[PDB]
Design a protein around this ligand. Sequence first.
Ligand SMILES: COc1c(C)c2c(c(O)c1C/C=C(\C)CCC(=O)O)C(=O)OC2
Ligand SMILES: COc1c(C)c2c(c(O)c1C/C=C(\C)CCC(=O)O)C(=O)OC2
Ligand SMILES: COc1c(C)c2c(c(O)c1C/C=C(\C)CCC(=O)O)C(=O)OC2
Ligand SMILES: COc1c(C)c2c(c(O)c1C/C=C(\C)CCC(=O)O)C(=O)OC2
Ligand SMILES: NC(=O)c1ncn([C@@H]2O[C@H](COP(=O)(O)O)[C@@H](O)[C@H]2O)n1
Ligand SMILES: NC(=O)c1ncn([C@@H]2O[C@H](COP(=O)(O)O)[C@@H](O)[C@H]2O)n1
Ligand SMILES: NC(=O)c1ncn([C@@H]2O[C@H](COP(=O)(O)O)[C@@H](O)[C@H]2O)n1
Ligand SMILES: NC(=O)c1ncn([C@@H]2O[C@H](COP(=O)(O)O)[C@@H](O)[C@H]2O)n1
Ligand SMILES: [K+]
Ligand SMILES: [K+]
Ligand SMILES: [K+]
Ligand SMILES: [K+]
Ligand code: NA
Ligand code: NA
Ligand code: NA
Ligand code: NA
Lengths: 365, 365, 365, 365
Amino acid sequence: AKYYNEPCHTFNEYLLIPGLSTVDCIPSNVNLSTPLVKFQKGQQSEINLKIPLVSAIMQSVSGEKMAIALAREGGISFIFGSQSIESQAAMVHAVKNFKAGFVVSDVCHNELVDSQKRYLVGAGINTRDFRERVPALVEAGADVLCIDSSDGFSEWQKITIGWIREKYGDKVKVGAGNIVDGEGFRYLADAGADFIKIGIGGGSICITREQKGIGRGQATAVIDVVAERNKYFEETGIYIPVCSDGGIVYDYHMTLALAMGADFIMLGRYFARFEESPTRKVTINGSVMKEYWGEGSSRARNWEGVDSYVPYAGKLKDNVEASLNKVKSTMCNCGALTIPQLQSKAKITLVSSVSIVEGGAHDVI
Amino acid sequence: AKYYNEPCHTFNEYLLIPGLSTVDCIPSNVNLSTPLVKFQKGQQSEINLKIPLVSAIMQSVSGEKMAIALAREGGISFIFGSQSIESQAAMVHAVKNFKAGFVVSDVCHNELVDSQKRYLVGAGINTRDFRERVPALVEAGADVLCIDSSDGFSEWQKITIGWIREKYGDKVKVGAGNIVDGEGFRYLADAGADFIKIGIGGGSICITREQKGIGRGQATAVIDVVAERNKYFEETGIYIPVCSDGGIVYDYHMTLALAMGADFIMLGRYFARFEESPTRKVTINGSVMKEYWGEGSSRARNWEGVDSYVPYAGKLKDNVEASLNKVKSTMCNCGALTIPQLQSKAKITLVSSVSIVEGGAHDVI
Amino acid sequence: AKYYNEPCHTFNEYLLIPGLSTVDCIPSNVNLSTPLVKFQKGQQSEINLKIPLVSAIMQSVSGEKMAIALAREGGISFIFGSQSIESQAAMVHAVKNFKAGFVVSDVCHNELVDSQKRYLVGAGINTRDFRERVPALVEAGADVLCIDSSDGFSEWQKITIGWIREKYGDKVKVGAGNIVDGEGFRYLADAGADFIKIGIGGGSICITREQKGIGRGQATAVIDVVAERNKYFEETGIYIPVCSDGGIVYDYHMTLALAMGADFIMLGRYFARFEESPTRKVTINGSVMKEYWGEGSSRARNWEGVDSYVPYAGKLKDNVEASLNKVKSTMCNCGALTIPQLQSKAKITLVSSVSIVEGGAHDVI
Amino acid sequence: AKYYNEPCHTFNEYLLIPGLSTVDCIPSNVNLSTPLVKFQKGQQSEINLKIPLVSAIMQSVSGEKMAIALAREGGISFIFGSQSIESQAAMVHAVKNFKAGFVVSDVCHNELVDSQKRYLVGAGINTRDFRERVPALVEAGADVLCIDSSDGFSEWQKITIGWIREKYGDKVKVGAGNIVDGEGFRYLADAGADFIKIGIGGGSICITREQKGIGRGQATAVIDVVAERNKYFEETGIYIPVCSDGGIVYDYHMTLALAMGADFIMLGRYFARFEESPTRKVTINGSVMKEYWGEGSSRARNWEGVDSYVPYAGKLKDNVEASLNKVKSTMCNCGALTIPQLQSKAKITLVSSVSIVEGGAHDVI
Ligand SMILES: COc1c(C)c2c(c(O)c1C/C=C(\C)CCC(=O)O)C(=O)OC2
Ligand SMILES: COc1c(C)c2c(c(O)c1C/C=C(\C)CCC(=O)O)C(=O)OC2
Ligand SMILES: COc1c(C)c2c(c(O)c1C/C=C(\C)CCC(=O)O)C(=O)OC2
Ligand SMILES: COc1c(C)c2c(c(O)c1C/C=C(\C)CCC(=O)O)C(=O)OC2
Ligand SMILES: NC(=O)c1ncn([C@@H]2O[C@H](COP(=O)(O)O)[C@@H](O)[C@H]2O)n1
Ligand SMILES: NC(=O)c1ncn([C@@H]2O[C@H](COP(=O)(O)O)[C@@H](O)[C@H]2O)n1
Ligand SMILES: NC(=O)c1ncn([C@@H]2O[C@H](COP(=O)(O)O)[C@@H](O)[C@H]2O)n1
Ligand SMILES: NC(=O)c1ncn([C@@H]2O[C@H](COP(=O)(O)O)[C@@H](O)[C@H]2O)n1
Ligand SMILES: [K+]
Ligand SMILES: [K+]
Ligand SMILES: [K+]
Ligand SMILES: [K+]
Ligand code: NA
Ligand code: NA
Ligand code: NA
Ligand code: NA
């Protein structure tokens, strides 16, 4: 077998060490734009998010209301593919035609839209019924697709991406994953993926141990994939955006993920807490909660995972603004006005096993 | 004294990183056959389990019902030697002649059997009364034997194996152990053991600390012994199968043990939970349990250990099938269709002390 | 991004290994004097504390009573700058003119005073209203100033120090910070700071995680900054005193901080517990407590942090004497009669993650 | 300051890996004799314990009854020096003349005795009143002395040993300590100590943190001192026995300490639990306990430490026999018939931070 020189680490094990903060670096001047799909050296990505956040490909997270609310703030949602093809396509259609009208024939500056001023939206696909699902999603106006899988290091993803390239060329964008090391990244890169998703085991509703025992600390996975991605860019001139998917517990984990090289972040739990998630708001002994279940739970694929509750946080807007203000502020502490500058200048340290306690409040009531 | 460069590690500290999964790798096509006894280069083992699981040499685990139920699924049981010679021989006889008849003279495709279609069965032996016990076990039809001891790195095991080789040549198969490093493996190998058992301290009912303070993390022990075993094979052309005995807490620990090089796994607690274990099913406040005690407990050698209870799991069959389906699935994630292929391709990483939390469910109710 | 070879560590992870204790080293002969502001090689600092302790620049810690009580024992207080300029200046004035009289016009041997026998006092300043605040503090008789910030690695601190040097030359002393590595130290050194404050995240009332995720273990930060400070001294002949700010939980952490190279220590919680802190003494179910809130709490900047309680410890005097007696005693165990000698001779070891338990009381009721 | 390449470790972090156990190694044939005082190459120590255990120099442990009971089993006690000179001398006298008679003038094979068949006994001394105390202890018949201190790396110990050598030459044996590294060992060795005591912080009733912050993991201290001791022996031909003092929680820690090179072990808590300790047997809610307080507690030096209770274990004899049987058994697992052979052959591994759980009982009720 093959072993590694170092054990893997998660986001909670790192802290950012400040760099020189210049007078021009104030939160309001920080630009959080980031590339969504691959491009060649010297070019810009055809699709750029205005904020580096995308909602997870999950029944309990990315419905049409979520896709609209997130696109309004500059991010994009990946409508879950764990439903009928007709049903998923309808959600995509509804998001693409939201600015049309509520009836029949009887102003956000950071909104993410296409040349027709329509909100951008993504859609998850699987390696099974893609020959039928993909065309339906394209016709519905889906702006980007993403193969949804726990282990993307599969010949099935290569076949799926190939079928798409052969039928649509580079006109249909498709993300692939998840992978956790350079090998996996490289395989999906050569296969043609437009962006590669990183992460296995990190998800809040994912229990590696009580399952198959596959996975890797999210930080180590990101750092490793990013290095491979950069090597790949140098060899081929092709820059493939990568997504850190899962494991985000605190807002600062977002800054860490971006600093380590992730272009954007995929979150489930974070977004499930919002009013706009498709789940039910349930009140439990004075506490308003929201349902949250993984795609691996029996409750999902009935059309490996856990079914739970997350505290209600209110509307997506105020929460995302609060989170990103903290990211922007930290970026300035690091001397960065943009994500690429942060990825270049960030000073990232690992913290001791016997520590972390000093970081929080201690010896006080 | 002699010290080591690295501290030892247990199974819970590792995770498997996926490899390329090909289209032909589906769980149902995974072959879990594995060698039980040593053979020369270019040959096949005279005895091959159909599944890499064997039940522990314990009074509370391997009785005749267990031996039958496990052999039916492709594994083998080692009838405990902590009983009279006449008593142990009778159990072996009963298993060997089960397909004869229930009265007097008045279709499982993965069953493990001999050329006479009789279920295979093993039997534990000790370094004391082997001159009387061995012959009785052979006459009873025991297919394989195994010296049962916590520290097999002993001249007593060499003497026992020698007496067997001198009286039966290579016609009687005998496993030896337990050992935890290359030195111990090598000693029992040169002594003639047909398979070597790995593990000291890992057992669920074993408390190293509150005892002698001998032992080693099961993962490190396996990895070390396997390297020595491979070196030995290269020098002599003799391949000695090794058994990871104890420390298996979760199903994925099985995949880990095999990936690290263990040919098969010995379990006690896992099998004690089944209907077929010889212990009593006792109901405690709505919870049906089964008794489980170690061979080192006073409750056993009365014919060092602990006496406890394990939750009833039902019949052996459905449980073993569920466990192995998960192993097979993980093997495909690793790009392996067989155990040898898994041992060759597995990518095994250690996980941080400050982690493991990310792996399971977190920040959710 | 930039990574490090070792994870950071906190004070709780270290222990001092004794050196040769000579007959002349008794606690009463230990000199705890230490430099407060920078000087050139061959000179002495214009200001020397008699004890290496200074109270934090916080509303709940350094009021006029605290400044007087601490100066009497040989330390200095930094009157909080999170109040009106007129208000802060009045506190400084009151401390400077305390030995004048209680009415109107109708003997501590370790006291820290100026050439006029008046108690020394410091005052915190910010990078915003310094053009108005500084002059007012100088006129009031402030002996030393200190820019109060969580991330001193800022162009704003350079501008502030510059404005001070241009208007007052080297006649007005100003400390800067906080920083946690050589880079940050070097930047503030070249900027002209008279002393540099070390520490981000360590504070008892500071929660890095639930915030921005910036920081570093206090021990590692001190050790790193001190090495840079020593390198800087060798290159320029300028010795810049450094302050370990925050993270002190136990008295021995004080000895550790000094041994690692910190010239003096800044504490908040430690001093808040005293009668002389400006907060209210509140009795909670038989326990007399004192309020303690960080400057980052909403309760403070209303003229990021937490509001809490700390157990009442009584008057500053008896507590500081008890603490320093322990430091002095430990210094002799290390063969040191002075702080510089301790920094030179201390033998400092890191302790294992799996330990620390042996250090305290164990296996006893 | 001076730092180290590795963090220190305690006994709980190690396990012994078995070696070849020969047929002649049975517990009853294991010899636990060990040297108490220094000797030259080619010679034997003038005093050899029959078992490697000595009771701590504590008021709550080593009284006359303890000294008698322990000497009967082959060990020696160090009558506490924290009492009047007349009082301590009387205890020594009583032990030396126990085989005389209970009234006035009106058969253990492992007993430790002198040429007059009298039980051996030791006595602790301090660096203060030794000019009066020593003569009184010698006249009383004390067989060996030991300077009692938490930091033996002191010029005071050199002066004390010197005064003894000048007045008695090498006729009076005196141990010194405690130290935790090669430097300290070397200093007391050159000073003339007959044996050197290792350990600071390990004691069950010692709380390093809540004190001065001096100390080192007991295992690391022993390993380091032993290496220095062996180097010293090679350079001078003088073999100085060393004592691992404190930190023994389990019986296997005894085997570990000896395997790492300690010639003998000093214990406090272990012996306090016995009927023969001078403290009071107190019954607390059905549990018979014994008082146990450190020499650093105010309760002691009233003629830094804690006052507590330890569960009653009964008579010293049965307990020491049980403990040593386990040590002897483990020694055979390691292929050792004597302590020197164990120190030479022991294979000692460190165990992972994330482990230790596997070692004990797990996943069972
Ligand atoms: C597919 O959605 C995921 C993803 C993206 C991830 C994980 C996961 O468990 C599931 C659910 C797993 C399912 C439905 C089993 C099918 C499969 O193999 O894909 C994970 O651990 O990392 C990433
Ligand atoms: C023999 O069965 C075992 C085995 C196989 C192992 C251990 C163990 O404790 C016992 C019971 C120990 C007994 C009955 C003491 C006799 C002996 O020395 O064999 C263990 O720790 O690793 C493996
Ligand atoms: C300024 O006072 C501090 C200091 C000195 C430190 C920290 C901190 O949180 C605050 C409060 C932080 C505030 C009021 C936000 C403004 C700022 O950015 O300065 C810390 O973590 O290390 C040192
Ligand atoms: C002297 O007895 C000890 C010993 C042997 C040790 C320690 C200790 O705390 C005390 C009590 C400490 C006292 C009475 C203070 C006087 C002194 O300095 O000796 C310890 O930590 O390691 C070893
Ligand atoms: N284990 C499951 O059932 C399941 N369902 C989804 N997931 C993974 O977890 C991610 C969400 O993680 P989280 O809640 O944001 O930590 C998803 O985008 C996906 O990669 N895991
Ligand atoms: N300590 C004991 O009393 C005892 N009895 C059996 N054992 C060991 O534990 C193994 C079972 O481990 P487990 O329950 O499967 O974790 C046995 O095969 C044996 O090697 N240990
Ligand atoms: N987080 C906050 O609100 C806050 N307020 C003050 N501080 C920092 O904490 C220090 C006090 O730490 P402590 O209480 O002594 O551990 C201050 O000197 C400052 O550097 N942090
Ligand atoms: N801290 C104290 O008050 C105190 N008193 C004794 N000791 C140390 O602890 C040892 C006993 O340790 P333990 O109880 O056996 O773990 C003593 O021999 C001595 O070195 N420490
Ligand atoms: K900065
Ligand atoms: K795969
Ligand atoms: K000393
Ligand atoms: K052995
Ligand atoms: Na903190
Ligand atoms: Na998880
Ligand atoms: Na202790
Ligand atoms: Na165990």
